[PDB]
Scaffold this active site. Sequence first.
Site, PDB file in Angstrom:
ATOM      1  N   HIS A  46       4.853   6.499   7.562  1.00 44.01           N
ATOM      2  CA  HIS A  46       4.679   6.165   6.169  1.00 44.01           C
ATOM      3  C   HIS A  46       4.161   7.442   5.473  1.00 44.01           C
ATOM      4  O   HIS A  46       3.835   8.416   6.135  1.00 44.01           O
ATOM      5  CB  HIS A  46       3.691   5.038   5.958  1.00 44.01           C
ATOM      6  CG  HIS A  46       2.347   5.362   6.502  1.00 44.01           C
ATOM      7  ND1 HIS A  46       1.969   5.126   7.793  1.00 44.01           N
ATOM      8  CD2 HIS A  46       1.256   5.991   5.918  1.00 44.01           C
ATOM      9  CE1 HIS A  46       0.806   5.665   8.016  1.00 44.01           C
ATOM     10  NE2 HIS A  46       0.295   6.195   6.870  1.00 44.01           N
ATOM     11  N   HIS A  74       0.877  -1.186   0.000  1.00 44.39           N
ATOM     12  CA  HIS A  74       0.000   0.000   0.000  1.00 44.39           C
ATOM     13  C   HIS A  74       0.902   1.220   0.000  1.00 44.39           C
ATOM     14  O   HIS A  74       0.697   2.163  -0.827  1.00 44.39           O
ATOM     15  CB  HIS A  74      -0.963  -0.093   1.194  1.00 44.39           C
ATOM     16  CG  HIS A  74      -1.786  -1.373   1.199  1.00 44.39           C
ATOM     17  ND1 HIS A  74      -2.678  -1.675   0.206  1.00 44.39           N
ATOM     18  CD2 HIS A  74      -1.814  -2.404   2.076  1.00 44.39           C
ATOM     19  CE1 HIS A  74      -3.284  -2.820   0.491  1.00 44.39           C
ATOM     20  NE2 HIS A  74      -2.715  -3.299   1.620  1.00 44.39           N
ATOM     21  N   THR A 107      -6.894   5.973   7.927  1.00 45.23           N
ATOM     22  CA  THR A 107      -7.278   6.270   6.560  1.00 45.23           C
ATOM     23  C   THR A 107      -7.153   5.101   5.616  1.00 45.23           C
ATOM     24  O   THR A 107      -7.458   5.253   4.420  1.00 45.23           O
ATOM     25  CB  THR A 107      -6.486   7.476   6.010  1.00 45.23           C
ATOM     26  OG1 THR A 107      -5.174   7.031   5.773  1.00 45.23           O
ATOM     27  CG2 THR A 107      -6.602   8.699   6.887  1.00 45.23           C
ATOM     28  N   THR A 108      -6.761   3.911   6.113  1.00 39.44           N
ATOM     29  CA  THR A 108      -6.779   2.704   5.372  1.00 39.44           C
ATOM     30  C   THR A 108      -7.630   1.689   6.149  1.00 39.44           C
ATOM     31  O   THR A 108      -7.719   1.785   7.372  1.00 39.44           O
ATOM     32  CB  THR A 108      -5.416   2.072   5.067  1.00 39.44           C
ATOM     33  OG1 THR A 108      -4.739   1.807   6.268  1.00 39.44           O
ATOM     34  CG2 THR A 108      -4.565   3.017   4.296  1.00 39.44           C
ATOM     35  N   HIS A 121       2.672  10.515   7.679  1.00 34.56           N
ATOM     36  CA  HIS A 121       1.963  10.122   8.888  1.00 34.56           C
ATOM     37  C   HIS A 121       2.926   9.454   9.864  1.00 34.56           C
ATOM     38  O   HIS A 121       3.441   8.365   9.542  1.00 34.56           O
ATOM     39  CB  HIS A 121       0.830   9.167   8.527  1.00 34.56           C
ATOM     40  CG  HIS A 121      -0.291   9.821   7.789  1.00 34.56           C
ATOM     41  ND1 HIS A 121      -1.198   9.205   7.069  1.00 34.56           N
ATOM     42  CD2 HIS A 121      -0.565  11.166   7.712  1.00 34.56           C
ATOM     43  CE1 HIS A 121      -2.047  10.062   6.537  1.00 34.56           C
ATOM     44  NE2 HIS A 121      -1.697  11.285   6.918  1.00 34.56           N
ATOM     45  N   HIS A 153       1.639   9.019   1.989  1.00 29.05           N
ATOM     46  CA  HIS A 153       0.684   8.889   0.891  1.00 29.05           C
ATOM     47  C   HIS A 153       1.099   9.901  -0.165  1.00 29.05           C
ATOM     48  O   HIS A 153       1.500  10.996   0.205  1.00 29.05           O
ATOM     49  CB  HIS A 153      -0.754   9.179   1.356  1.00 29.05           C
ATOM     50  CG  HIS A 153      -1.189   8.321   2.498  1.00 29.05           C
ATOM     51  ND1 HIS A 153      -1.932   7.217   2.391  1.00 29.05           N
ATOM     52  CD2 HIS A 153      -0.893   8.454   3.857  1.00 29.05           C
ATOM     53  CE1 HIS A 153      -2.118   6.665   3.620  1.00 29.05           C
ATOM     54  NE2 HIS A 153      -1.468   7.397   4.525  1.00 29.05           N
TER      55      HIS A 153
HETATM   56  C1  LIG Z   1      -4.625  -1.599  12.122  1.00 24.88           C
HETATM   57  C2  LIG Z   1      -3.741  -2.045  10.956  1.00 24.88           C
HETATM   58  C3  LIG Z   1      -3.604  -0.741  10.181  1.00 24.88           C
HETATM   59  S1  LIG Z   1      -2.256   0.305  10.968  1.00 24.88           S
HETATM   60  C4  LIG Z   1      -2.518   1.943  10.352  1.00 24.88           C
HETATM   61  C5  LIG Z   1      -3.359   2.218   9.266  1.00 24.88           C
HETATM   62  C6  LIG Z   1      -3.504   3.543   8.783  1.00 24.88           C
HETATM   63  C7  LIG Z   1      -2.819   4.549   9.454  1.00 24.88           C
HETATM   64  S2  LIG Z   1      -3.039   6.205   8.886  1.00 24.88           S
HETATM   65  N1  LIG Z   1      -2.878   6.269   7.262  1.00 24.88           N
HETATM   66  O1  LIG Z   1      -1.942   6.934   9.482  1.00 24.88           O
HETATM   67  O2  LIG Z   1      -4.355   6.588   9.270  1.00 24.88           O
HETATM   68  C8  LIG Z   1      -1.980   4.287  10.568  1.00 24.88           C
HETATM   69  C9  LIG Z   1      -1.814   2.954  11.008  1.00 24.88           C
HETATM   70 ZN   LIG Z   2      -1.395   7.200   6.545  1.00 27.01          ZN
END
Ligand SMILES: CCCSc1ccc(S(N)(=O)=O)cc1
Ligand SMILES: [Zn+2]
Length: 257
Positions: A91, A61, A195-196, A116, A93
Amino acid sequence: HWGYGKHNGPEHWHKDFPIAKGERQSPVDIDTHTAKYDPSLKPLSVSYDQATSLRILNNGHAFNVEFDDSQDKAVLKGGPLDGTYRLIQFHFHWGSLDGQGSEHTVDKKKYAAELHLVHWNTKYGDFGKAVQQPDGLAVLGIFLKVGSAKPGLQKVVDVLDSIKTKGKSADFTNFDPRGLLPESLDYWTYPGSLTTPPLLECVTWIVLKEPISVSSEQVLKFRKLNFNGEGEPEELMVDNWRPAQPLKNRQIKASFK
Ligand SMILES: CCCSc1ccc(S(N)(=O)=O)cc1
Ligand SMILES: [Zn+2]
Ligand SMILES: CCCSc1ccc(S(N)(=O)=O)cc1
């Protein structure tokens, strides 16, 4: 499985993850005129001096730079937060073009990318339990614009060719995430979600107003990553952002002005 394509992208996620249509989904558009200055908000405390990165991973991703979160080492506190949140990973986006890529928007402006920094509330003991709680996570979001290079990014950029495809990882020690921060820690904050998928409503979002600048060449290298695994048809890892979601019954607060 979910992803960012036509057939499996954000508009499809709700069928496997019905919270996608929930009451506190992220990202959102930050309408800077309607955000409330809150004089009760404290300065953000980012304490990354003892951060211990371990590895970088292409998860299909995005890529995650992971940290040892087994001691009290790289912590976020203050700001809108109660308590202590420990850094687990960061990470990004980003887009296929400089004019898109961020998840949050500012008066409908999209940035080229968004960083993020993900932190979990120590009161819940570990990340997996924290994501089950409404105050489990604090994600520090930082916008990226294209201009002058970010020298503190280049160590990440240069390792990317070793993690081109889904499931590759590489040792990544001694990476200092302080080199990814802008000069000011003025921020907006609101309650939201991952957000995922699984899109869990567990995040206090803290979005910095000041973007960092990265060079065209640095973002170009993000766009050479692949969403596919080795030996599968190449799908460039681009446009791995969720669009802005309805604000519903939420207030965005500003730490400034
Ligand atoms: C719970 C497994 C997914 S871990 C995870 C998924 C998304 C984010 S985000 N893009 O920072 O909201 C941060 C951590
Ligand atoms: Zn993110
Ligand atoms: C293995 C791929 C099946 S097709 C498909 C499967 C799941 C999703 S979802 N709701 O985006 O997780 C979207 C498309």
